Write a protein that binds this ligand. Structure first.
Ligand SMILES: [Mg+2]
Ligand SMILES: [Mg+2]
Ligand SMILES: [Mg+2]
Ligand SMILES: [Mg+2]
Ligand SMILES: [Mg+2]
Ligand SMILES: [Mg+2]
Ligand SMILES: [Mg+2]
Ligand SMILES: [Mg+2]
Ligand SMILES: [Mg+2]
Ligand SMILES: [Mg+2]
Ligand SMILES: [Mg+2]
Ligand SMILES: [Mg+2]
Ligand SMILES: [Mg+2]
Ligand SMILES: [Mg+2]
Ligand SMILES: [Mg+2]
Ligand SMILES: [Mg+2]
Ligand SMILES: [Mg+2]
Ligand SMILES: [Mg+2]
Ligand SMILES: [Mg+2]
Ligand SMILES: [Mg+2]
Ligand SMILES: [Mg+2]
Ligand SMILES: [Mg+2]
Ligand SMILES: [Mg+2]
Ligand SMILES: [Mg+2]
Ligand SMILES: [Mg+2]
Ligand SMILES: [Mg+2]
Ligand SMILES: [Mg+2]
Ligand SMILES: [Mg+2]
Ligand SMILES: [Mg+2]
Lengths: 143, 70, 63, 56, 145, 55, 206, 141, 63
RNA sequence: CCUUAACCUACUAAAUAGUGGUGCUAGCAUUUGCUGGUUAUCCACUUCUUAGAGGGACUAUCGGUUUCAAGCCGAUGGAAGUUUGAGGCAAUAACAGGUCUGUGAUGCCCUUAGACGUUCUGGGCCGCACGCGCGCUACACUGACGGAGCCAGCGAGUCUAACCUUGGCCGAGAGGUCUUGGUAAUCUUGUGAAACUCCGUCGUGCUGGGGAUAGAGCAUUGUAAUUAUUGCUCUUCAACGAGGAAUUC
């Protein structure tokens, strides 16, 4: 029939790209993983421990696919949630541009995204290629 | 701290032999059978479904629901 | 336990010092041709159906 | 030069507010009655509308 | 995940670091009823300890428990960030410690003694038993002492 | 702004607005007509601006 | 049901039911009748709906409260106690879950058993605070159907809210618990009690 | 040049534009199918127009919709309005009138404001309160 | 409370007095009439002066 | 009357708004197809968006009720039928209401060089047994936490200057650093807001609800941060288990 990733529902795609980015083994996982907290506006680290770098890799990937070009900042603001300033009201806070900037470099190094012109990070022709592929792999699970 | 955070062999086979007649089974219904707290009662759900007994007729978080084997 | 259904026929006016009561003439459906006037609690329009819990008693003014 | 358009248009109104004052003091005994400011090439034109122009 | 079984392997309550630890809690949260061991410090240590966080404080090998202690009171050796730590840059030998169990109480006292003994207005302030951090005092805090 | 100079009263707030309307038209022409059409068509209070170029 | 497809495909039971019966989440609006005279015109049930969410202008006039699909009344009354003010997706989902629960217990269209629990907790007559002179006796009044519906819903939700507070059991379990008990009066539900009692003190001062 | 109409749907500030060309029958929103949509609980709110008039009706027509503005629920209503208003905008112009008027009939019959945009809008907040009616809090003395 | 001001009811007066041949139980033609016949300063007021002339008209006809 | 929020496939239009075609091009399917990219490669439009000019509603049609009066009520129609929603404006008169602490508006009085003038240094308005008010965060399971889904509108922004700030690296974080666009429907910005949705963890235990109080280290604004301007990490883990009489909206 043909396929995109937009044809695949947001979460089971991102679990799909996750289980597959894990299979692979290729990645680069800086090294401060597990010992880190994704946001100043966060309490506990993620519970994936050995992982989640894959999930946000999948998340980052898919999101870059859906559009022109996006940089580390827009990902901070995206991946940024609500911090309880404790007894003081909540305020939106951006999450860490380290987790993202190293994710974008690890997906660029594995050639699924590319330092787009104008600014940001365009999705790679080989990324297009392989996302739509595992997309199809994800629908084909459901046959 | 009021019991039901572990497995005690008799509790296993009690689960196995007590979940018919349960038209309603869920996190709250297993706790209510004076046993397993929400951590391991959710494991008892994922493993009673490993084969038999519970029919999954409800989806997700907080809420869950099963019935007896037909 | 003898229920006695009665359909509002006309709306009379609010009673009670507060003004939440509504006076109303009702014809009970099980054998019409006989009226009683009751005092309600909720909102009411014409042709509703009230469950008169006891059949023969009526009121008028409220304070 | 080089200002925002908003800031420019407000700034012009302050320019009006002050001018009207300076005349409303200065020309009291000449029956001053209001100004207008007209902008052109070459010049910047202010017209005193007062009821005794031989004393202005 | 999986219904487990075990035998009499797990003994509830187990004492470490001069404090006591309830069994039958998700271990990570058990090390926090020790002093100086928050939810993040506990987390990272067990992660670094090669332990199953899934597990309760119940199971756990003795060998594990001891590796847990080792990591807790020797952070910078087991390559823990040091900014992850409650007592950076001491103030005498200037090393970075993570003071734990009955000892945090000591240093809390130790520090305050320095302030008082130097006569600094934060000492004076702790001494009068007030709020130090500068918060207004007219209205807030009445029941108190 | 609050209506009162001072502080007493209910806290009546007012609100002032000035309306800035912008328009632009593009024309191709010689130099004579631009200069003819721009010195005249003068209007006090309206801001006329004439640039040039394709950058 | 004669399946059809085009490009973007429409799943099986989706295609199926929709074009066929115009039923709920996937429950039956046909059959289900308000087992009480009166209360009809004040319980909806037809036109059927899919889920309990509507850009409903049920407020701008006096009784257009009464045309509202009755399930969407229940759900609407779920989302309160401030922290849950708004949050209709929350309430609506709790209803679907709740309805899935009732149906497991004793079958019956669970939307029907909801029709029954609403009818079976409306106070046939209540009391009001008359003047009568300083010391104010209690006049027995006959409460409107519309008040009987409203009060049934307000009772049933609050009672289930009160039990859901501070225990493992989730809202929908106790809701469905409340409605199941209330369906055929058994005095074990907070609503059946409070109805039965308002009718005891309304009888005592007449 | 193929036959095609464009429409829109508006609840609160959410506007939803909808193109209705002649095709093999897609039903896509922004860029993803109408099987996704999620809200999900609300999903059958946007299926609704398809099912009130027959899924069949869409086999000669490709349908794309893109939504900007509003909020999560404010978009689910705007789209389904755009779809139904589109389905009758194609029968107004291409197929005959009787049929269109038989679609406005089983749409407005059951309804949910499918062809009729809701007029409800935010009220202004006024001074003295944190809402439009909600005044503050006085204590007298 | 949709009670017509005096300026409305009074204009409706002088119109129906002097332009009763012309005018008819139709607002829309009465409205346009009020353009070609009467000098009002606002659309809103004109439709008020009209839709009311239309009412009076509508009931001069049965007495 | 004005203003704003609602209705115009009618009018005038738009590379600072957008849409359809075409080129140039990516991917997935290949049988056409699906889903992106390309401030000008052109062609066409104006539904979406913008604001000019209009139109529109007059509680209209019909029916109830009313002295068959002004009006009220119900239905249908309708973008709209509570003064269409919400404001702006607003007579006569009154108070010893507030304001000499907004005014280089002012009478009168005080003071005027050992100053009640002005400025500089430092402290104070923050001082804490405690009464009163407005509030913020909470007591959790319609919940906290962690992944992930991911959606607004009113704004505002740098010249003789340092404002709004994308992107790239570095940094756990706060932040840093080299660059960048915008005097702005053009850049920040689609302000990828937050509740919220979803899949998990926890499981009623002052618990993983709550985050006061405090310790230690790191940064940012500024000449200056001690009595801790703010931000961050770790640790410390209070009271509060729904709140008397009362009382706001
Ligand atoms: Mg977000
Ligand atoms: Mg998030
Ligand atoms: Mg601790
Ligand atoms: Mg508001
Ligand atoms: Mg072909
Ligand atoms: Mg082809
Ligand atoms: Mg237009
Ligand atoms: Mg209507
Ligand atoms: Mg108006
Ligand atoms: Mg006085
Ligand atoms: Mg003054
Ligand atoms: Mg003076
Ligand atoms: Mg001042
Ligand atoms: Mg003055
Ligand atoms: Mg002085
Ligand atoms: Mg002060
Ligand atoms: Mg006071
Ligand atoms: Mg106040
Ligand atoms: Mg969450
Ligand atoms: Mg915007
Ligand atoms: Mg560092
Ligand atoms: Mg520059
Ligand atoms: Mg407690
Ligand atoms: Mg605690
Ligand atoms: Mg917390
Ligand atoms: Mg200081
Ligand atoms: Mg001080
Ligand atoms: Mg300050
Ligand atoms: Mg309370």
């Amino acid at each position: 029939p043909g396929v995109s990733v937009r044809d695949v529902a947001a979460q089971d795609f991102i679990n799909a790209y996750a289980s597959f980015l894990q299979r692979q083994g290729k990645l680069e996982v800086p090294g401060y993983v597990d010992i880190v907290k994704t946001s100043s506006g966060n309490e506990m680290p993620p519970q994936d421990a050995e992982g989640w770098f894959y999930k946000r890799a999948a998340s980052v990937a898919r999101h870059i696919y859906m559009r022109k070009q996006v940089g580390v900042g827009k990902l901070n603001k995206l991946y940024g949630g609500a911090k309880s300033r404790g007894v003081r009201p909540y305020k939106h806070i951006d999450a860490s541009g380290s987790i993202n900037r190293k994710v974008l470099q690890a997906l660029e190094k594995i050639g699924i995204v590319e330092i787009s012109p104008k600014g940001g990070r365009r999705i790679s022709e080989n990324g297009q290629r392989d996302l739509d592929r595992i997309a199809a792999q994800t629908l084909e699970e459901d046959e | 701290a009021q019991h039901a955070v572990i497995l005690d062999q008799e509790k296993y086979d009690r689960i196995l032999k007590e979940v018919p007649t349960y038209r309603y089974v869920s996190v709250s219904v297993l706790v209510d059978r004076l046993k397993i707290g929400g951590s391991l009662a959710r494991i008892a759900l994922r493993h009673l479904e490993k084969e038999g007994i519970i029919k999954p007729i409800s989806k997700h978080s907080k809420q869950a629901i099963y019935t007896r084997a037909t | 336990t003898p229920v006695t259904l009665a359909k509002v026929i006309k709306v009379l006016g609010r009673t009670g010092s507060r003004g939440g009561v509504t006076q109303v003439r009702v014809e009970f459906l099980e054998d019409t041709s006989r009226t009683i006037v009751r005092n309600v609690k909720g909102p009411v329009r014409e042709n509703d159906i009230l469950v008169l819990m006891e059949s023969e008693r009526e009121a008028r003014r409220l304070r | 030069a080089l200002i925002s358009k908003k800031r420019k248009l407000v700034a012009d109104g302050v320019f009006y507010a002050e001018l009207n004052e300076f005349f409303t003091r200065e020309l009291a005994e000449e029956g001053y009655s209001g100004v207008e400011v007209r902008v052109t090439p070459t010049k910047t034109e202010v017209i005193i509308r007062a009821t005794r122009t031989q004393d202005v | 995940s999986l219904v487990v079984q075990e035998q009499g392997s797990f003994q509830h309550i187990l004492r470490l670091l001069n404090t006591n630890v309830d069994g039958n809690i998700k271990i990570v949260y058990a090390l926090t009823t020790i002093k100086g061991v928050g939810r993040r410090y506990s987390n990272l240590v067990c992660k670094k300890a090669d332990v199953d966080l899934h597990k309760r404080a119940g199971e756990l090998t003795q060998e594990e428990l001891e590796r847990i202690v080792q990591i807790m009171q020797n952070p910078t050796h087991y390559k823990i960030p040091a900014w992850f730590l409650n007592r950076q840059n001491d103030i005498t030998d200037g090393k970075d410690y993570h003071t734990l169990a009955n000892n945090v109480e000591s240093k809390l006292r130790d520090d305050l003694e320095r302030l008082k003994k130097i006569r600094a207005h934060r000492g004076i302030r702790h001494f009068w038993g007030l709020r130090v951090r500068g918060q207004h005092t007219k209205t807030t805090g009445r029941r108190r002492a | 702004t609050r209506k009162t100079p001072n502080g007493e009263g209910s806290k009546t707030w007012e609100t002032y607005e000035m309306r800035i309307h912008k328009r632009y038209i593009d024309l191709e022409a010689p130099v004579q007509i631009v200069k003819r059409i721009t010195q005249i068509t003068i209007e006090p209070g309206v801001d006329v601006e004439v640039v040039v170029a394709s950058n | 049901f004669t399946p059809v497809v085009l490009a973007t495909p429409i799943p099986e039971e989706v295609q199926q039911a929709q074009t066929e019966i115009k039923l709920f989440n996937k429950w039956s609006f046909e059959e289900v009748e308000v087992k009480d005279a009166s209360l009809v015109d004040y319980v909806q049930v037809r036109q059927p709906i899919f889920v309990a969410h509507t850009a409903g202008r049920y407020a701008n006039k006096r009784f257009r409260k009464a045309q509202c699909p009755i399930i969407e009344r229940l759900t609407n009354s779920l989302m309160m106690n401030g922290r849950n003010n708004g949050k209709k997706l929350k309430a609506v989902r709790i209803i679907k879950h709740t309805l899935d629960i009732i149906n497991v217990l004793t079958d019956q269209n669970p939307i029907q058993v909801v029709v029954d629990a609403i009818t079976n907790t409306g106070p046939r007559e209540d009391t009001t605070r008359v003047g009568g002179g300083g010391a104010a006796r209690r006049q027995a009044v006959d409460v409107s159907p519309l008040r009987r519906v409203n009060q049934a819903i307000a009772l049933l939700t609050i009672g289930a809210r009160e039990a859901a507070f501070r225990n493992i059991k989730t809202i929908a379990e106790t809701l469905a618990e409340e409605l199941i008990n209330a369906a055929k009066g058994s005095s074990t539900s907070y609503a059946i009690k409070k109805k039965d009692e308002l009718e005891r003190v309304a009888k005592s001062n007449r | 040049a193929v036959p095609s109409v464009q429409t829109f749907g508006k609840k609160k500030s959410a506007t939803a534009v909808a193109h209705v060309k002649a095709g093999k029958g897609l039903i896509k929103v922004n860029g993803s199918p109408i099987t996704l949509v999620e809200p999900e609980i609300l999903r059958f709110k946007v299926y609704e127009p398809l099912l009130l008039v027959g899924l069949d009706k869409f086999s000669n027509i490709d349908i794309r919709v893109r939504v900007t503005g509003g909020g999560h629920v404010s978009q689910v209503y705007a789209i389904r309005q755009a779809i139904a208003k589109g389905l009758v905008a194609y029968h107004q112009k291409y197929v005959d009138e009787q049929s269109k008027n038989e679609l406005k009939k089983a749409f407005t019959s059951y309804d949910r404001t499918l062809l009729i945009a809701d007029s409800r809008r935010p009220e202004p907040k006024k001074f003295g309160g944190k809402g439009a009616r909600s005044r503050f809090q006085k204590s007298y003395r | 409370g949709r009670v017509r001001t005096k300026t409305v009811k009074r204009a409706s007066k002088a119109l129906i007095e002097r332009y009763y041949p012309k005018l008819t139980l139709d607002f829309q033609t009465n409205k346009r009439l009020c353009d070609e016949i009467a000098t009002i300063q606002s659309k809103r007021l004109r439709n008020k002066i009209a839709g009311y002339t239309t009412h009076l008209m509508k009931r001069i006809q049965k007495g």
